Amino acid sequence: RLSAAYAIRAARISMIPGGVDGLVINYAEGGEPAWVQYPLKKQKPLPNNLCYTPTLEDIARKREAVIAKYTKQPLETGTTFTHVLNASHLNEQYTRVKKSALPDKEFPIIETEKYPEPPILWETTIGAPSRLFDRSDGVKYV
Amino acid sequence: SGGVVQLISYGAQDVYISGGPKTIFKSYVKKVNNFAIDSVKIPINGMGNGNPSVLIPRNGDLIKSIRLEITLKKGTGQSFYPAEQLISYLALKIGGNIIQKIDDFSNFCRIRNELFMDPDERHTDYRVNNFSSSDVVGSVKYFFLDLPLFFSKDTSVALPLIALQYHDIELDFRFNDVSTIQGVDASYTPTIEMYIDYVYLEQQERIKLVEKPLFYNIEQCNFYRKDITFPALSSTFKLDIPFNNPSRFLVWYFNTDSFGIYNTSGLYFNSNDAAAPLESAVMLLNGTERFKSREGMYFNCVQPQQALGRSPSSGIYMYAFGEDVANATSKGALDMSRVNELSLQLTTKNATAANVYTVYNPQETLASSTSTYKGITLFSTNWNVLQVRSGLGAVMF
Amino acid sequence: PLNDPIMIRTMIVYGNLSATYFTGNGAALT
Amino acid sequence: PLNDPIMIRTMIVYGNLSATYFTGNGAALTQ
Amino acid sequence: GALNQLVAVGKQDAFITGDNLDNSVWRNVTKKVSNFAMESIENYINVNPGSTTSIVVGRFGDLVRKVTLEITMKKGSTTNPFYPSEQYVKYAHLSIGGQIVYRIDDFPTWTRVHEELFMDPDTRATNQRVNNFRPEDPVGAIRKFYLDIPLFFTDDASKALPLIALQYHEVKLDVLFASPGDIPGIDASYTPTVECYIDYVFLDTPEREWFARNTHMYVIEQLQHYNNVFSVAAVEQTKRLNLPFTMPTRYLIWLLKTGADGVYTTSGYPFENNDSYAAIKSAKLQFNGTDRFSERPGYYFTTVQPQDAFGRSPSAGIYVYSFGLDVTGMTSKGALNFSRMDNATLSITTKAATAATISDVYNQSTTLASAITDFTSIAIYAKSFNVLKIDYGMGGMLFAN
Amino acid sequence: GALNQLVAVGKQDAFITGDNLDNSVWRNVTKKVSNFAMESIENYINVNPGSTTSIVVGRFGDLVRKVTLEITMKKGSTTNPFYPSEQYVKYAHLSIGGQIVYRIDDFPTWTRVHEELFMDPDTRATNQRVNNFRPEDPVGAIRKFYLDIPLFFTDDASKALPLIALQYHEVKLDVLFASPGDIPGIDASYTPTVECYIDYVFLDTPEREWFARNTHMYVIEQLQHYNNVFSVAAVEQTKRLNLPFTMPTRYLIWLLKTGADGVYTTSGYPFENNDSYAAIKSAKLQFNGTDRFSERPGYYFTTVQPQDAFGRSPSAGIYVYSFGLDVTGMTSKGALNFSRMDNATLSITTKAATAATISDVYNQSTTLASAITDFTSIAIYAKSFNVLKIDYGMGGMLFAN
Amino acid sequence: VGFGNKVSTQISRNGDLITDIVVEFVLTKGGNGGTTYYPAEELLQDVELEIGGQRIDKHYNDWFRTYDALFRMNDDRYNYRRMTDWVNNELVGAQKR
Amino acid sequence: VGFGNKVSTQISRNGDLITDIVVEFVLTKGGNGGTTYYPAEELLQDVELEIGGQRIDKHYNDWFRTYDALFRMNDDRYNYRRMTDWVNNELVGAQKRFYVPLIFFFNQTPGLALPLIALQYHEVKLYFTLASQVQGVNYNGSSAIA
Amino acid sequence: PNWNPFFNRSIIVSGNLVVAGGVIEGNGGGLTNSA
Amino acid sequence: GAAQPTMSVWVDYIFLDTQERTRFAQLPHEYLIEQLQFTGSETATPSATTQASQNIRLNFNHPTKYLAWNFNNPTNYGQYTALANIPGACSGAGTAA
Amino acid sequence: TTQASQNIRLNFNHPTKYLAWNFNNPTNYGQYTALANIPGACSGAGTAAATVTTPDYGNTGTYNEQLAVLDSAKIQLNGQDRFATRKGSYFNKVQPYQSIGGVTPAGVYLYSFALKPAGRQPSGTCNFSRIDNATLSLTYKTCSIDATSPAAVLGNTETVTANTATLLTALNIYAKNYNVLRIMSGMGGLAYAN
Questions:
Q1: Which of F81, F231, G69, H117 is 20 to 30 A from B304, comparing alpha carbons?
Q2: GO molecular-function annotation terms (chain B) (predicted)?
Q3: What secondary structure letter does DSSP report for K103?
């Protein structure tokens, strides 16, 4: 229980984080005016650090790029023929790729069917409950 | 003047935790679009032939739940969850494409229900799957097994049947011969009949429901089994995890040659971990350990106590990848398409004497283990996406 | 609940038991 | 308070059973 | 270790993960509500003739949220009484401004259904600890019982009776207590002592003043009751039960009772979960001559309908059908309007009285013990919606019925 | 069939049917949260020779939610132990930056209350499965118990210790183990092995950076403990106990114990639901000489207050009164500020310690077993509010106590 | 197909209009002459027509008997019974379509 | 399914084309070696193909036997015998899984594969007639095997 | 796992108690067990 | 030893010519068709000295051609009347058996 | 007492025509089936000198399904079954019937991805270089029949076989592949290698 006369002394000796600014403090002894708040500083820089590492959506993009790269390209080329004759060819392509770079997207069977007659709204009915016609329940007594 | 004093007892301490416009006594309401539900009795094809299945008829706009009514009799055998043990297989396919496949059905249903159902739903589950012991031999009663299909978990992911105008939904499943149950009661052809719960929507919801494309974030079930010869000594089994889709939890256990028995105790509902087969386990990702090996009791009770709240019977072990496994919202999952190596190492307990109360060490289990156990099973519940566009539904991945 | 007092295959009790009637074989003390 | 008992109907146990002492009307089978 | 699952992601994952916006699991946001206090205030009962008791709720606070009826009785005999605190009460009619707005008729029947159907183990066990005196205690022991009155506003604080907003007329509860010697079967002729304690909420001045002066329309539940005389025979009888209800309902309950005790089955004991002791074969609920669903077995209605809606299932003899898919939350999710369907009928087919005992000669599925010929009635309960409008210090029902 | 429910509608339905906007229960409005990983990193524990051992939480992740304290022990007697894992722990003091912020004093007492008050049948039974071992197992059997310490941040992930945001100091808790050879009664001259496993949450850079850099203010609970001597005599004695508590609280619990074992009733056994073994006849709370409510019986505090506060009632001997309308959720809904009221008092009237052989000759309502004269003390617990401010890598309490 | 079971048929749109539907049942009697009474008629106890998910009509066991007993007349009703019953004092083991 | 019964099946559109269809039976021999002669082929008597309810053709019990004896040859005909009969002097009580491949226009070569993707408005189904008497399985000559 | 294993203490029965198998205990009781 | 039935549904299809097929396929149609409405009830049939009355509440809709009704013994399909020891009115009628 | 299941992990790469396998007794070349006291199956078979541990070697191959050890099998790709479970008799008779057109003796099994695996023109494939994992799931017959009693061997059901089947201790799974042989300027090699 502070009187707000001790708002800074308390903040200091108790090592309360930052300053008293933006916090609500009790005042004197009665009619507790609990609305007494110290304005928060806007010139409040965040700690300056290098805590960040690559974001996950960027990793996801890289992983998908890798899946696309090895869909068409080999993993390793047995470049045993480099300056041999004219054989730019005869270098075996190594194609088993680790799981993390394989697609797991399945065949787009929704998009390839191309039904000649496009969809219709499957409306059904049991008819109108005509015994209830001209019988509103919104009529009030006056 | 109790309340008056409590209001006078105010100060800054209260301002941090309460105050402002928000009033719980505001007496506000929420509304939903109108709907109506009924149960349509439908026939099952091939029941006495081979592998039966049903086609879901268009008797409504959405499918919210399917349950199967089984009627059979008592015959002194004393069996547990007959309704579940009469069924061996259940799958649901959209347009011939399987999207939920339940293998080892009777144990899956029992374990999924014990893990996720609370005292009131689990107790009723019992009531509608089992017999009443007080009944006369030869009595006949109705069983109502709720099928653990991915769309029945939550009203909101009901199958948008109206939105699947070109191909239908088929549920294929298989039955055990009635005589299969170790405690089977009778050579009585059970009456087996399915009811499907249909939802009717308002017209303006039907219009936007079919016109716009739908994406449902749904559960898929899966299954792997590897048979073993259970050791007398605490050796370690290398259980590969040949799975792909992202998952929130996986459950494994050592099965026997009966139904529902996951430990060596020989009592049916076993709370006593003394009969548990697993000493410890560690999960590895890309050939490297995620955590220090934890004992079987951790995975049997401590992990589900945090993830679900409910602890299974002894012998069932679970590991979670998220914070709230029972939620309809995804709360953390591991992506098994991107981790190069997935394995779970299971170290079994050492064999000791019968009369199970006798077991002395966490590392000890019964010598009866070598005879009773036939294998290790693994279930993994995965997230996938059910896409419905222009009358066609399919799983995206 | 405590209203279907039917058990299968096992039972042990620590304290005293109180009941109206009874049945079963006999291997009892005194 | 969930296990501690109050039996309102006939209790049935299909197996070996034990207790410390008993108190009630006797019509058992063998003794 | 675990970071492997954090970085090992792809499109399939990104589809179902969230963005960096404020909807994540963590980043706790402090939630605040207005400043209020709760007080439990003794409310002295002016009426004790051993007949209808009028309990007037004094305006001792701003809102009233819960009503606790405190009853003191002694154990009249060796047999354990079955909810003696609720059997002593025959009905409770809540009125506002002189208009009756909630009727709890055949009170122990609605509360036992309410407990078995809508309360979980921790609250069911508690309700019994303060109502159902069955420990092996000596005969003549005196106990204080604390029953709640299941009124429309006691389920959620947000519907608490806004008494401060009712400046001209009060709220009163008419409770009739049945004579102690009529039904319980276990009574000492010791006149019960009845006291009532209810709570009050006190709002701080900004909301208190606004709330009292701001006209507000409260959407509340009402309980409708029906019963008739019902009997069974040695044949599979069928009866059409009229349903004289109005206003949208979320579910409808019916139960077959031996109205001598809280027993709905042939067992003759307080509880049963074995459908073989209940006498209903099948039923369907019909409107206007057309069937919403085919006849389903009696067991179906006891367990499957309430399990799909809310997990819980009552004892046998209690049968429930739900119109919507959620009947315990405050949001209305499906209801059938009994004011628009002119002919509402409940069709019940019973089981035959053929057996002497259930354990010996119980037939396959359509009979049970002849003890069912001692059944006296079927009671039907339903919860409907109405609007309680509090305007210029007076209240009443928006929809007249 | 069911479609009749949608055509037979009218104005009455206007108060339950929603608009054409997506407020229906289908066409799910999907919520998504960011990707994260969690790991259980084992903590080294320094030697605990019947003394304090410090458990230091290192920065091996971004947030920590729960602390699991695992103890491996063996049974040394035929007596079945009662929460031997909790009896072995005597207290745990949690400090942040060197400042003590949360304490669990007389630890087995608070955790048994916590379990009965907060845990449902499945969670409660499970918590027993990992803390008790009661089959008729031989003496010398070794079992590991998994005791979760109920720290203020364990109940909801979103309040998990924001360690990444505390770059200049650590967080630790001091757990003391007083003795295996005093109260459990199962000592086998065996020093139990104690290990601690805690979880970590790992967030991706968008939230990890925001969270580690921005200022945070968490509303947290604190546990305050008081005890005094509380004897009971053969006459209806009263006690007037000062309540030296501070800060807004949601509820307070007080219990009478035989601090020799985990027994709060004269029965000599845990979990007794029969008030004939409990001493308190009635009680009231008082602040600055003015009474908060009319004296309510002891049984009221054990079985009625819990229904509104928890939806769960403890066994007798544990008495609770709430100030808010919800004491288990995260949002504060009513509290009494014990820092503004100078004199808080608990006034207890007991029953006469004159009864014996309770099942046969127990008096009616004013007595309890004379064995109550072996009770020694009353313990009072309360949960108060405080604020954990995290700013520029340092954390602490706003309100010092 | 069986006693007490529900079966259905989807109507294949082989033609343009659909009219007369006759359901064939093959039964073997276990009784003697005069011990049967329209056994093929009570066999179909609940038959109903849906078009597009909703009910058009629903007929019952005793409706068929009540309607034939009330609305059918002549040689036509005798012929009807020939189609649904045994009318020649047929003995145990007789089977008829 | 059973002796003398007629059954049918409709082909779910699991894929785009239909090619080989194989009908399998589980059957117990009621006699000793030499008592049966293509008992799986006798059991599976007639097969009728419809596309959208329009009949394309119908195969009969005796035709299957003629086709096998007339066009199937060398290793292929013996393998067939293995697919439909007991060929190792098996004795009474033996039970085996038999396969009887169908021979419609789309059942022998992929080039005539049935285009279900292009027939979404004509459901394709097979009607089967099963034998009432199968030699060595439920009758020996005309004598019933109990 | 609830109610299927054994008990702690003090079972009060308002009706009969029926067993198949054997009962392991002995005490005074009804008319017999006292001769 | 009673056998299960064998059954199938035979549908008479009508095939129209080319020209009217266009008219039927393209044009709107309305048909004036019949429905059956049915719910079961139970009687109060006395034995001696009483001619009981019973008021049965009817739940019907739309333009009704007629109301027909009958009484049955639920155990015997079509037993509209009482059984008696007269020709054709019970088993063994006319004899001591 | 049991029909064991065994998960055989495959280590194949490239587009293939088919997977074929057998269960071999390593001590006797070509012994893919159980041995039993039936004609031609064992040394001395049919006489009192018969022994079921030694085959009548020149007639080692048989066409008797009851001496097979495989009850059922399915191939699973990335955790999802490639086709529904088929009985061992399918893989021995049905697949080579429609795919090859010849007769395969008992104990040798084939599953094809190819329409004409016997031909050299490609007729379909399965590319095991892009499938992360594949498993051949085998269910064995219960080998409970006494091989010396022809009354039981020639008269039992398809789910059991003779006790001598337990000697078939080696499993030989083969994959028939595709590759491309490139020839250029006097040198050559394969286009792909894994």
A1: F81
A2: structural molecule activity
A3: -
